[PDB]
Amino acid sequence: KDSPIIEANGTLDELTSFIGEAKHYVDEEMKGILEEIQNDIYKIMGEIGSKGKIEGISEERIAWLLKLILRYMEMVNLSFVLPGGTLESAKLDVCRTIARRALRKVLTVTREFGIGAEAAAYLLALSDLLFLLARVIEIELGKKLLEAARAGQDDEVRILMANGADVNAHDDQGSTPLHLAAWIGHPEIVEVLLKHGADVNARDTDGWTPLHLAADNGHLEIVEVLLKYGADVNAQDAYGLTPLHLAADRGHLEIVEVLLKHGADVNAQDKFGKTAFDISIDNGNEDLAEILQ
């Protein structure tokens, strides 16, 4: 009954208790994973409390964590983010920090008693897994917000962000929930996302902003809104096109009028050498050419 032993066990007890809470906020797979972890923690406590007399977790348990880590690692592609992006991920971040406190206590025991090194390695791997699990949850709420925007569900969109979904999440194609609303034609979604910090000038993999999408697809009302919240009316994509070149080529005159009122440059050249006006001339569009000059 040396303090390092008691404190390590007590802290592990604290750890599994928080895990016991967290597993009520996660899906079936993570729930099962956390329960196996609770079993491992109990197994570890048996080793520590008996000063290594009782065998603890096996190397297969460490490898078991590692396999899960490798699985979830390829799902996570971090900038730096603050802990607790969502209510659910917050639960895991709390478990992570407790696990770290548990590791320090168990590591102290190992250093002083020469036992539990495998358990310490396990707990170390555990912390890494817990980190990822939290990030994966945030990515998944991100994906559900993208889905809501793509589907056109105005309430889902509000709900997802209220629960912690990142308004600036993006799909494999670089499109954010704001790009999705701008392309599809849902002004109400465009508005609530801008309101909660969506980057009006985010670029997708084609170099397009939500304004390029809205301008190209004839979404006049959305174009107006994007400009109000600071869209760069002269943002150029990968090929040098501005939302004006796109609106011009499509013949969307009302949008052209809006773009020009906000300082769009009718004489801007893309990487091919074409200007918005020259395009109205190439397409034989006499009315557009009047608006652009």
Binding site: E59, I62, A63, L66, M73, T110, R111, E118, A121, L124
Partner: protein, 117 residues
Amino acid sequence: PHLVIEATANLRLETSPGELLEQANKALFASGQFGEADIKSRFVTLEAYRQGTAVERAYLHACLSILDGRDIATRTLLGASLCAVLAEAVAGGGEEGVQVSVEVREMERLSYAKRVV
């Protein structure tokens, strides 16, 4: 870090030595302990070897050399991580089970020299 993997000539792998080294480097990098470009590993086949004194036997051993500063949990996890990767890479060899082991040691940081040419 510097990783050396040595295998008996009679040891059969599931994958090539090259693939094993790549997997080992991934296992090391995934630890978050290392810069990707710094991870250096090599593999050697042992042609002149004996295990014990009595028998057809194969073995696989690796030594991971790192600069000092890591704790016991980190070194232990690194060893277990590599051993798992290496063990799974063994298809057979000899007339009995194959021993797969990994040691982790620390290099003295203060005397350590490095340059890039």
